[PDB]
């Protein structure tokens with residue numbers, strides 16, 4: 001009957017370790033012992049299993065695979081766990097906690113498509129890069145109300161636990177999913193949403209499934225405009241997002257809210273070789289009707305500068321035409337009128353035409369526009385005067401004191417201004433899409449919420465710019481948040497309760513890297529960038545000179561390379577990254593000629609006019625004598641997010657990428673181990689084994705299962721499996 005106890009169910013077939021045979025049983029009852037060793041001293045992440053054949057008071061002697069005998073100190077020995085542990089669902093149960101042992105367990109499970117594994121109090125998820133039938137409604141129904149220890153590891157399980165904690169403690173919760181680019185953060189986020197929507201959805205009729213349905217449909221919309229193919233992930237999220245799933249006092253979903261972060265606007269006008277622009281561009285050109293393509297003056301992606309420079313217009317296994325159908329159905333369900341949808345595609349189309357405008361040098365240094373085909377097509381779909389747009393692009397007016405001076409930009413500046421317009425149009429459209437979605441989703445004051453964080457993951461490319469710094473900085477802060485909660489706060493609690501705990505230094509601390517980036521006193525990188533950003537004579541060169549001056553040979557996480565004069569390295573928790581300074585000032589200032597804004601404010605299109613008239617979308621905090629910079633704006637939004645997260649009970653999911661080829665069944669030890677190390681996975685397990693997880697105040701420990709407030713002799717007979725703090729009683733591991 002009960003699926004979890006029926007070895008024939010899909011639950012058992014796809015979520016539990018397969019039954020071993022009599023031969024494995026023989027090996028499982030063996031008295032022989034083993035160690036994980038490095039056949040090649042250089043490759044410390046490549047292990048083999050060797051049998052221990054002898055030992056001394058302080059060393060082991062084992063046989064290698066080839067046959068030679070090696071000796072090693074017992075203090076430096078990585079013993080292999082009894083194979084009965086191979087596949088264990090919670091690695092905190094492992095007898096030997098060492099790198100090769102932890103990797104091996106994950107490998108055994110991975111080899112039989114068990115991608116989820118507990119690592120103490122948090123979940124580990126290794127990307128399978130293939131479909132596994134463990135997310136059906138049947139699967140959802142099984143974890144409902146189950147205790148973590150009662151069911152197999154699963155993203156649904158941690159989701160249910162956060163949900164039960166929210167109701168039992170009446171405290172907001174948060175699901176923080178970490179991982180480098182392509183690790184699986186977005187897929188797992190969708191699953192947390194799917195699970196919450198179902199488990200706490202309105203179990204009534206179609207209507208009672210409208211909200212929940214609009215919640216799930218918000219994703220396809222955002223991904224179509226916010227995701228793109230990069231060299232690390234075919235569906236890379238180019239924006240971060242904190243999703244608030246709201247519940248009423250009864251525990252029913254009452255709504256949801258989405259906060260988007262740092263959209264990579266630059267991708268609209270530039271893409272590295274083999275990458276793509278945002279999905280939506282390809283979806284429109286491939287899935288639009290002949291009518292629409294005529295009205296929008298559309299054509300093949302190869303006919304557009306913004307889509308024909310990477311050498312890639314399609315993704316293997318993806319039908320852009322079919323995806324366009326999915327995107328449109330999601331807009332319908334969410335609530336985008338047909339008039340609004342057309343305006344949206346007009347903007348997308350307009351952007352493409354703007355990209356085809358070719359500026360040329362005129363008689364003098366000023367640029368001219370010989371062929372006006374693209375300019376006119378763009379103006380047509382946007383609903384603006386082409387004559388005004390042309391002038392705003394090549395001859396924008398600015399102030400020179402108080403005097404009004406018409407400029408005449410050369411080819412390079414005209415092209416940049418046109419790109420600025422494009423990026424502003426895309427960025428504002430995205431914010432608008434998010435805004436519209438939220439108004440529909442937010443229809444009542446929440447009583448509680450479970451926040452799901454899904455940011456752009458840690459990434460390194462051949463060329464890393466300001467966008468990568470912001471992305472990696474964010475990932476660095478998320479890691480410190482894990483370190484803060486798993487180690488710092490945990491031990492501080494022991495210290496305050498005085499339960500005879502000697503402080504342990506786990507060696508995980510990204511504060512130095514974080515300060516190097518966002519520090520104010522002394523000023524970090526972002527601070528010096530802002531300073532240069534308002535200095536009238538600053539250049540990309542003065543900026544990097546400034547950076548080297550403040551940090552070269554002075555900050556341990558910074559490096560001035562000897563092989564370049566335009567790059568600087570930052571040692572992140574996930575590895576050192578070299579950043580190219582080109583365009584940082586312009587990207588931080590994020591300029592846009594006012595004449596361009598004036599031109600579009602007069603747009604005949606309802607959507608376009610709102611992108612330039614709505615102050616919440618078109619206005620910019622002019623805090624000071626200058627507009628707030630991207631750096632100051634983002635640093636601010638991030639500090640706000642972190643403050644919010646601190647008011648919740650956090651649940652961590654560490655996504656792990658198996659390799660860098662987006663291939664299934666190919667778990668690479670070096671790639672996986674690097675992530676396990678920088679994520680602090682083993683340290684997190686150790687703190688859980690050597691620590692005291694649960695703890696309750698004495699006075700309020702009167703059998704939640706007399707009343708004097710002393711936990712007095714409430715000894716329910718182990719003196720080692722607990723302690724007594726100044727105001728609480730702690731517990732070793734199992735209750």
Ligand SMILES: Oc1ccc(/C=C/c2cc(O)cc(O)c2)cc1
Pocket residue numbers: 230231232234274275312316661662663
């Ligand atoms: O099954 C698979 C599906 C997709 C891929 C991605 C390949 C790929 C293609 C590129 O142009 C650049 C890149 O960095 C990676 C690999 C395996």
Ligand SMILES: [Mg+2]
Pocket residue numbers: 185186187235236237455456457
């Ligand atoms: Mg993602």
